[PDB]
Scaffold this active site. Structure first.
Site, PDB file in Angstrom:
ATOM      1  N   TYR A  53       0.976  -0.794  -0.131  1.00 49.69           N
ATOM      2  CA  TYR A  53       0.284   0.218   0.174  1.00 49.69           C
ATOM      3  C   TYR A  53       0.900   1.618  -0.053  1.00 49.69           C
ATOM      4  O   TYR A  53       1.772   1.623   0.982  1.00 49.69           O
ATOM      5  CB  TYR A  53      -0.818   0.138   0.599  1.00 49.69           C
ATOM      6  CG  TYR A  53      -1.694   1.384   1.593  1.00 49.69           C
ATOM      7  CD1 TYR A  53      -2.899   1.839   1.114  1.00 49.69           C
ATOM      8  CD2 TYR A  53      -0.850   2.310   2.014  1.00 49.69           C
ATOM      9  CE1 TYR A  53      -3.611   2.754   1.043  1.00 49.69           C
ATOM     10  CE2 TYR A  53      -1.580   3.862   2.685  1.00 49.69           C
ATOM     11  CZ  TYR A  53      -2.395   4.001   1.885  1.00 49.69           C
ATOM     12  OH  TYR A  53      -3.387   4.924   2.017  1.00 49.69           O
ATOM     13  N   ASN A 192       2.404  13.718   1.852  1.00 49.05           N
ATOM     14  CA  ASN A 192       2.630  13.833   3.278  1.00 49.05           C
ATOM     15  C   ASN A 192       3.644  14.535   4.279  1.00 49.05           C
ATOM     16  O   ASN A 192       4.843  14.173   3.178  1.00 49.05           O
ATOM     17  CB  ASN A 192       1.920  12.754   3.148  1.00 49.05           C
ATOM     18  CG  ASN A 192       0.926  11.762   2.844  1.00 49.05           C
ATOM     19  OD1 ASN A 192       1.134  10.658   3.078  1.00 49.05           O
ATOM     20  ND2 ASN A 192       0.109  12.171   1.998  1.00 49.05           N
TER      21      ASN A 192
END
Lengths: 506, 506, 506, 506
Positions: A53, A192
């Site tokens: 992921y 992020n």
């Protein structure tokens, strides 16, 4: 300043420096191994057709599906473009520089799986003084502002160079670069993070510190102007209370004021009467403010060096792990903490200004002016400081206590750190105005003690002001005097009088 | 607990203990020299007909005038009576006890010039479990509540004994005492101080800590209930961010959750999908809260031991000095700091409760109940937690940023610490209610994973609840279940599961 | 008071009356047709096997499914039990009575489809002075508190009678009732509504009004005590500004003060000098407060009569329609509006108290006491009023600006009206304390103007206080005097001096 | 727009017009008598050697002393110069124009004793589009900003003409003027007043209204995009609640939506399921907002016409009277009132945006984009709206509840209206951004209902947007789309769809 960065070791003083001025940096050779090893880890996962992921997956539907190489690379571009959804005024170049350097710093610790060539692209931008457009608002704590920054790397968006906007292609060329194409994980590595939140709050901290230092000098000048006592600064008092901020604070006042001055000595007996709390409780109030800003600074100094993207790559073990380090909750609370200190520095100074206007407490002419029946003197300057002080109370309302769910309830608690940090800048303008007026009044009051001098550092402060603003002999247009005092403060005119090693970044 | 006090050395754990339960104390012999020497200093000043403000002077007019012995002693009574101008609900006995012990502690450091016999009178009250009436409101940070306390020493006011109000004479007699007559400086020694401010905020801290510990267990139960992952708690993630509160926090989650459980194992693959932030960002959010409460606790632990009256007596030098240590600014900011932590613990828990109601995120039946077409299950319990969470935002507004001038502008900046601390108690009731509901929902959700167990400490938490509240099989009167869960939390039912040395007073 | 209710026609004065005292009520005969016709409409929908959401459906899964009669009736009980998920202190009987009467009023307009026998059951409870337990918290604006109320109708929960808790069966019997079984739509008719929100805010309004009236008398007494002028109350000034609240306000001051008094006349020339804003701007500040509370009262008077359940039954057309009238947003803003008025009444009064302490502005002895060198007089009472005034600023933070999603995002915006209204009660205690202290100081100040009287209504105010609290001749225990003044205010001692038709409910 | 002003009769629509665009004005002949009579009154007082505070006196020392003519005229200049002590960013020309016109309006009612030639000087400035520099901050509610404005009349300060700063002499000449010399009372007539406070809050109102109108159209588009129902807008529902704002609001929704549309009809049965509160409670929430802004507008419309200087001249009686009409308390509360409406418009819109992102509630693709596994669509635009909505909560904190004493406690309660009004401008940018994103999402959602049209006015809204921003077919740089939508809103693109006579100034 030239900087050979050992990633994760930036000091608060270096950060102030990056914030204040252009930087030239390169990575220390010791950074390459971990940077390159987390890239090799990503490369091995892909080579081996493993699924991970946030490395070679899609999202949601595809969050557990190994996307084909082709859409994988297109996915990186699609993330940056779609996430560059910020709005509001462009950030100034100083703050953009600070955010670039924090991102470089965080990425260069080697837990992000991003190619060294892309880190070096950002470093080339910083070195070239080429600063991507980044809008002020949008992050809930920093996908949007980091995406805007990242646009330039891809040949999109725009960037400032020597104060003018350039196309991204144009800006890349200035820095010796061509558009990059992102690889697996690099979209998330750039987008992020908590660097915008952290940069906003660091600016708040630096302003708070600037204001602290100025307030010790101004407060000392006011003590002297109204024939206040040095006894409340006695070390024994502060030692007996035990609070470190107050102890360090009182020590700063003693250093600036000294044991006595020609003004204090010439009023032989100045005790026979007690000083108001806005003078006498300066160590306790300013000390609390100092503790508050040191608490904030400890958290922000750590966060300037944090690995804040996701998922993180642990090449030593071969593991990639999804966590939540992008959540800027500690920054938002740090910013809310700095709000109380900036507010209360201004509150205490405003009450000192009001003391100096009051003939029954100042031992000076009402509102610090001769022939007051037809001259108003500093009367409305105190009003302006009252307006600025008051605005800070509402501005103190915390943002870290709010959240709205995003990403259809998957991203269901957020920090609001950007808003928390950016309100500090205006709180600091407010307090800076209050101190500017206090600086002007105390120098005016001391002037009325004809021919008498205060201490060596405090005379330096009087001279700094009088180089630009004259004694108030009779009513004149007041505002230019306040403008001039504020600009002197903004430039750090009083910061250097404060002793070393008191403030986190100084 | 029996306590031989070395003044100025109380630990946060001792303070929690004093707060939680009756105490028996005596002064360590090492306290007598400084106590008795500052009294002898006052005695010598008077013997020598010297004048010293706040020792043998009057105030204002007489602030530099050596009052005659006769009015000097009457002045002490006149101060206590006139300053006992508080209003509002009586403080509970626990808080009164805490304030008495902090005052004893502060005075017993020997910088106050108050007779040992008067300190011992207060200690006799504490030992006798006789607690002066003290009204909640009035202090701007603590003349009024300290005056109320002091009334009993003089044979005025009233006091609680075994839950009933006694006349002061009656209460003194219970403790083996007769009314005292105060001497020079003792009025100010008792009335100036920050002990009520400090006691109010310590209570807030202890509640915040209680809530922190409960939230780690509840949050762990919710992770398990919705088949969440343990990966976000990986130590490597938190180490890479660098924030100590988050690191300690993640370590607590790992201890409670363990590496796996029958529930986690029985859902073999629980990653293939990402956990919402209210689960996955627990270390980052709860960690920020932990840092915030440790910052507050450092300041309050120092203040519990501070010399906070005025003027202070420095018998070694023979000096008496007027300062401002009564100004409770650092306490008010500490309390405002705890507000953000109590708020955000509740905010994060409420979003976990909302997750558990949502069939699309919980992997449980909607609102955690079978046959939902005609059963509502936990639907309105989530509403109640939303109401409680929301109220905390407004309650978070800081009080340390406000001040009003008092004593006709001589006492022109004050802290508002009492209001800052006392609002924390209701914020903690709010958050306690939110966690109570989260506790109930996660246990209900785990119950629906028929026969499956979670980790060893988390099963302890399930058993604690199920000893009082049954599984929700079909709609029934809901509120008694929430009442019961709240009372379990209030009693510390989950506190002991948290590892040692994490929380300041635990 | 005996009340024959024409549903939807309650006046603010009737509501104050219901709030203040027990009521005996019956429905006007003109109410029966619409009540009975909306029941017949529901009955016809069921007779005809039609499906109608919130009449004979289930929820969610079954929200479009015609539930069988059997589960339909069980569904009503299941809703009340499951929705009675409130927590916190029990409401006092006055507020419970008010909520019952608003619910009766709303239901009795005949748009709810609820049987007249059930409305009459609630009316029997009110007439019997039997008041269901209702916990304070839980509603986000009023399923939980209305469910608690409704529990008693079903023979569940508990109720207060003559100050003691009775079982529901016991309480029903006191009122001549037996447990009821609810029919289609009656669960929603009782549980959806805004009556708790509205009751909480009405209480805030009534307190605000009480405080307004008291502040005009206290403010007048302070004007007189410090030899202030009546000129700022000249009608011409207020007419020229145009603001109705200020005009009505100034008219109230003129009525109480009159054109002159023995005190004003005996200081022949009181102008030669300007009054401070806390005196001279009373019409402008109190006037703004009056406008604010009239704006709130218009909204709350409408809402006390509103049809606020769901879905609504329009028997004339045969339509049943799902809307959102339960959303109490206008009440929450009304409550937030009243917060500003209660805050600012207290703020202005506190600055008047501070004026009276200041010898340089009061023309009275410092702190209103003879021989101040050793007497403190009102010094610390002003401190207490400062504490109470300050607390109101944070308490002013609006709750109507917050919301959290509920019912798994179906009920995704809510009002937080209950929290908005209930904080007003404590804001009113705070301001009530401030005025109590102002009342005491101005009477003390007037006493020092030996033998001189103020106006006829203001002497009434002096006599009211002096019936309980003596002149302050020398320092004594202060707090009982403030307690006594507050209790006089709480009982409406000064309300009757204000002219009629000024305040919404008076 | 050409304006023949009857002083004191400006309508809210005229004020919007003055705010939006340049004006040409002259006084109605009916204004001259009262203007000239109050000047003659001042002239007679001086002719007769009478003394009158604020006419021919000094201040404080001289507040009851008839200053000589010579210093009297110098006193006027000395007031303006000394009071021009404002700081911060220059106001834009629109707001400066508005403040000039309110001051002209107030003065021209003839209670101020200021020469008609000086009023006409200001009118000449307005007509010439010459706008004095006025800094944003300093007033506590408006001596400083009015003084800055007044500087130009005297040949001091600076002024904007065609977007460039001119010397005052230069600017006067542009308008056909030479420097004026002020007479008795004219300093106070120009400097005392509430026009800056009022102008700031009027701007807030106009923005609130603009946002209201846009939100009805956007909210209608979202209802249609997610196949929501028109039933919640049924007039019967709103009539039964009784709240006028909600009734007018629902009527606006019905007008825009109509009884049905091709989209509503093509989903034959859209009820079988209930709409979320962010749709279905639009009349109740937006209605509350409408009431709130009408309450504010009533107060601000009165204040735009108020006589707000001091002392006032009552030539009919020969009296001059010192009052407090400069105290802007009602404006500060009006501004705080508008804060709740701007906040809640944005809050409700953000929850609609979040609904549209959620596949389980929208009946659209997740985040409104095709192929979401690798496209993010509107995901981060919703994040930006969440950031903007959240910032409004803290910004809602009221400023009318704060005050600091000024003028050495003579001016001891003030309003803080300027800060209250100016924060509204940023609150409106925040909400404007939220609606911009909602506008974009609903049009995108409707586009996905291939070929289907909504109502006639709502198609106008879709076309307005699509003239500038295309359908979102696949991820692209998002922010320019939001910028474009915001600019369309700022320009009033949706305002005209709202029916007439709903909003105070429209």
């Amino acid at each position: 300043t030239e900087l050979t960065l050992k990633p994760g070791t930036l000091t608060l003083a270096q950060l102030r420096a990056i914030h204040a001025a252009p930087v030239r940096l390169q990575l220390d050779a010791s950074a390459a191994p971990a940077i390159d090893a987390s890239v090799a880890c990503v490369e091995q996962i892909i080579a081996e057709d493993r699924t991970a992921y946030g490395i070679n997956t899609g999202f949601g539907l595809l969050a557990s599906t190994r996307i084909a190489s082709h859409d994988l690379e297109n996915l990186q571009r699609s993330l940056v473009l779609s996430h560059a959804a910020g709005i509001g005024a462009p950030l100034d170049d100083d703050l953009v520089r600070l955010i670039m350097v924090l991102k470089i710093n965080s990425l260069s610790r080697g837990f992000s799986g991003i190619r060294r060539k892309v880190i070096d692209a950002l470093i080339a931008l910083v070195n070239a003084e080429v600063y991507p457009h980044i809008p002020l608002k949008g992050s809930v704590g920093d996908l949007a502002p980091l995406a805007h920054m990242s646009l330039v790397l891809l040949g999109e968006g725009k960037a400032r160079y020597k104060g003018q906007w350039l196309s991204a292609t144009e800006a890349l060329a200035v820095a010796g670069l061509e558009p990059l194409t992102l690889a697996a994980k690099e979209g998330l590595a750039l987008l992020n993070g908590t660097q915008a939140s952290t940069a906003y709050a660091l600016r708040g901290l630096f302003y708070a510190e600037d204001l602290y230092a100025a307030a010790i000098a101004c407060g000392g000048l006011s003590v002297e102007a109204v024939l206040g006592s040095r006894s409340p600064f006695d070390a024994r008092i502060h030692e007996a209370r035990g609070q470190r901020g107050q102890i360090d604070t009182a020590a700063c006042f003693r250093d600036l004021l000294g044991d006595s001055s020609e003004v204090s000595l010439s009023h032989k007996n100045a005790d026979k009467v007690q000083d108001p709390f806005s003078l006498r409780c300066q160590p306790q109030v300013m000390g609390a403010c100092l503790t508050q800003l040191r608490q904030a600074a400890e958290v922000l100094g750590i966060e300037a060096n944090a690995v804040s993207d996701n998922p993180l790559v642990f090449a030593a073990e071969g593991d990639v792990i999804s966590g939540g380090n992008f959540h800027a909750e500690p920054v938002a609370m740090a910013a809310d903490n700095l709000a109380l200190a900036i507010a209360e520095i201004g509150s205490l100074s405003e009450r000192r200004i009001s003391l100096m206007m009051d003939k029954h407490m100042s031992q000076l002419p009402p509102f610090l002016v001769e022939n007051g029946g037809v001259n108003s003197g500093f009367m409305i300057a105190q009003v302006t400081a009252a307006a600025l002080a008051s605005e800070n109370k509402a501005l103190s309302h915390p943002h870290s206590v709010d959240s709205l769910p995003t990403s259809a309830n998957q991203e269901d608690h957020v920090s609001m750190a950007p808003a928390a940090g950016k309100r500090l800048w205006e709180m600091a303008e407010n307090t800076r105005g209050v101190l500017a007026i206090e600086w002007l009044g105390a120098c005016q009051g001391l002037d009325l003690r004809k021919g008498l001098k205060t201490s060596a550092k405090l005379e330096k402060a009087r001279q700094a002001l009088r180089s630009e603003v004259a004694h108030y002999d009779r009513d004149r247009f007041f505002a230019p005097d306040i403008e001039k005092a504020v600009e002197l403060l903004a430039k750090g005119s009083l910061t250097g009088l404060l002793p070393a090693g008191v403030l986190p970044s100084l």
